[PDB]
């Protein structure tokens, strides 16, 4: 855990950094100007106030300023005041403080969102961002609960929980979803419901702000947190936010190291996650193994998965037990064709499956990649021998010497058919015996609507020259989605079964009942596949095969985000389209508000046949 101390009083700054680093904090949120030093910018004599306006640069080194200090905007700066003089002084002072922080090169700046209307603050911030070159992040300091909702019931004659999120949403929408504007969330004593926290966790939260007043004390007098607070801390610790501790020491008998020590205690109290580490919210282009040739280092991460090939070997083992009785155990030889044999792993899985099933197989390893044919043929010379026949041909062009009993393939993508498993297996179906088996015999794709401001900003950041400016929103992305909110349960899109003894063009309509209020940002695509009868591989988040990491989910973005209310069903439509030369997907949201069909004619993304 990495954490900081928010101080509003820094009498001398080097002493304060010393006293803050001794007690374990990693940065310090401090005001660059004096919080009570109101400046005047328009009227004399106070406009011409002499002397320095703030502290010198030279009190800390450049590395100290760039790494250790998070600036704060002064509390009197009120750019959305109803008084025009206060409003203009606050615009000028906000610009002065932001420019001084840019000059100091602070890594972050902390600005407050403590009311509904922050339009002028948004304009001054978005004009600072587009002026000059600077690299500060802007952590907008927004609470979980509005300050007028957690006040005591003391006054005798005087959107409830979705309120401050709408403050933040309006702010980040006025600033046009800037990459440099994020959230510093204040966690008070009164936590909101669970679905409010999910929207909050789908946002750009770089910091969490924990007052020392929300800490409750134990029998020994230390600061601890309630179980609901601890659960919120664990969810935030999954996002790797930093924790800012504000307020005074409410447990005076101890010292201020105790709050931080409790946070580290919860930090230590907190294979797919290890593999996916470093790839979270990192967009990738989906593989196209039919139109491109894969590097050996691409095949290595395939063969790094033991669960998928163990499941394939189990499916082949059960199929070989079914197709050959114990009486015909030796005089019956089953023809297997591994289609797209890769560098070996399905051929080895088939050999092991026939070895543990105690059945005889004649195996063909078909592979179009000549560079993988090199390693397949070295395997064949060195290990496999005459049992395996290595074919350097496309399965759709190959002329088989004899028909097959089982054809086994691994041509499934993250959305189960974006790597042309239907077309390839339909081409390879003619050398299958009339009672032959295809492994996998079944696969379905699943879609769920998601919200993620970070994923949307990465998709925008994928905008490239020499290209349509919104082609990036018409491409699926293989992404280990991490900082997102899923709006509804997944629901099956497309189903393909092999062999097909009957058109791979598909049209699906999916209605997702959204029981909460959200802002739809895209769709996540998963898949399930039945290899043989009860052997399945799934990346669906409720049926996910444990320990399997060969497939990250697919993201289908949408060009503009769609604001969704509670009780509003999201109706989306997906097409699997094709021609003689290429296959693509088209999608469109039709309810609650329509969007354009994304990727028409495959103009931004096709899969090459």
């Amino acid at each position: 855990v990495s954490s900081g101390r928010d101080l509003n009083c820094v009498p001398e700054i080097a002493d304060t950094l010393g006293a803050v680093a001794k007690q374990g904090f990693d940065f310090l949120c401090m005001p660059v100007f004096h919080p009570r030093f109101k400046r005047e910018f328009i009227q004399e004599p106070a406009k011409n106030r002499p002397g320095p306006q703030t502290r010198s640069d030279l009190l800390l080194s450049g590395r100290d300023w760039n790494t250790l200090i998070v600036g704060k905007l002064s509390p009197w700066i009120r750019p959305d005041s109803k008084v025009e003089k206060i409003r203009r002084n606050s615009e000028a002072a906000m610009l002065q403080e932001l420019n001084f922080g840019a000059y100091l090169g602070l890594p972050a700046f902390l600005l407050p969102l403590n009311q509904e209307d922050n339009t002028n603050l948004a304009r001054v911030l978005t004009n600072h961002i587009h002026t000059g070159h600077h690299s500060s992040m802007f952590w907008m300091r927004v609470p979980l609960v509005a300050p007028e909702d957690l006040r005591d019931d003391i006054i005798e004659n005087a959107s409830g929980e979705e309120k401050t999120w709408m403050w933040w949403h309006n702010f980040r929408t006025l600033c046009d979803y800037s990459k440099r504007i994020a959230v510093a969330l204040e966690i008070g004593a009164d936590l909101p419901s669970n679905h409010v926290i999910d929207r909050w966790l789908g946002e750009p939260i770089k910091a969490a702000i924990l007052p020392t007043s929300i800490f409750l004390t134990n029998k020994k007098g230390f600061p601890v947190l309630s179980k609901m607070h601890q659960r919120l801390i664990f969810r935030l610790l999954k996002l790797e936010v930093q924790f800012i501790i504000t307020g005074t020491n409410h447990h005076s008998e101890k010292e201020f190291c105790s709050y931080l020590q409790y946070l580290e205690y919860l930090s230590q109290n907190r294979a797919y996650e290890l593999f996916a580490k470093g790839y979270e919210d990192y967009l990738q282009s989906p593989l196209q193994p039919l139109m491109d040739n894969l590097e050996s280092q691409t095949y290595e991460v395939f063969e790094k998965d033991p669960i998928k090939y163990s499941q394939y070997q189990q499916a082949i083992y059960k199929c070989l037990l079914d197709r050959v009785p114990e009486e015909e155990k030796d005089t019956n030889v089953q023809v297997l064709m591994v289609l797209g044999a890769g560098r070996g792993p399905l051929v080895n899985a088939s050999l092991r499956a026939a070895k543990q099933a105690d059945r005889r197989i004649k195996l063909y390893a078909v592979e179009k990649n000549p560079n993988a044919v090199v390693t397949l043929e070295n395997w064949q010379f060195e290990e496999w021998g005459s049992q395996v026949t290595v074919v350097s041909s496309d399965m759709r062009e190959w002329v088989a010497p004899e028909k097959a009993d089982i054809i086994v393939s691994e041509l499934l993508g993250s959305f189960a058919d974006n790597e042309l498993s239907p077309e390839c297996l339909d081409g390879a179906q003619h050398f299958l015996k009339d009672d032959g088996v295809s492994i996998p015999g079944e696969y379905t794709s699943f879609l769920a609507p998601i919200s993620s401001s970070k994923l949307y900003n990465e998709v925008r950041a994928c905008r490239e020259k020499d290209r349509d400016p919104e082609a990036q929103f018409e491409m699926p992305y293989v992404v280990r989605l991490h900082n997102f909110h899923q709006l509804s349960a997944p629901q099956p899109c497309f189903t393909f079964s092999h062999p097909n003894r009957d058109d791979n063009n598909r049209y699906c309509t999916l209605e997702f009942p959204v029981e909460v209020n959200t802002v739809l940002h895209g769709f996540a695509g998963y898949f399930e596949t039945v290899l043989y009868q009860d052997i399945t591989l799934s990346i669906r988040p409720e049926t996910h095969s444990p320990g399997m990491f060969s497939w990250f989910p697919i993201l289908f973005p949408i060009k503009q985000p769609i604001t969704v209310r509670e009780g509003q069903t999201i109706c989306v439509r997906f097409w699997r389209c094709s021609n003689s030369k290429k296959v693509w997907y088209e999608w469109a949201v039709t309810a609650p508000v329509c969007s354009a069909i994304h990727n028409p004619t495959g103009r931004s993304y096709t899969i090459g046949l």
């Binding site: 020994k220 230390f222 601890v224 105790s258 020590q261 205690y265």
Partner: peptide
């Protein structure tokens, strides 16, 4: 110390 860390006990709830």
């Amino acid at each position: 110390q860390f006990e709830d």
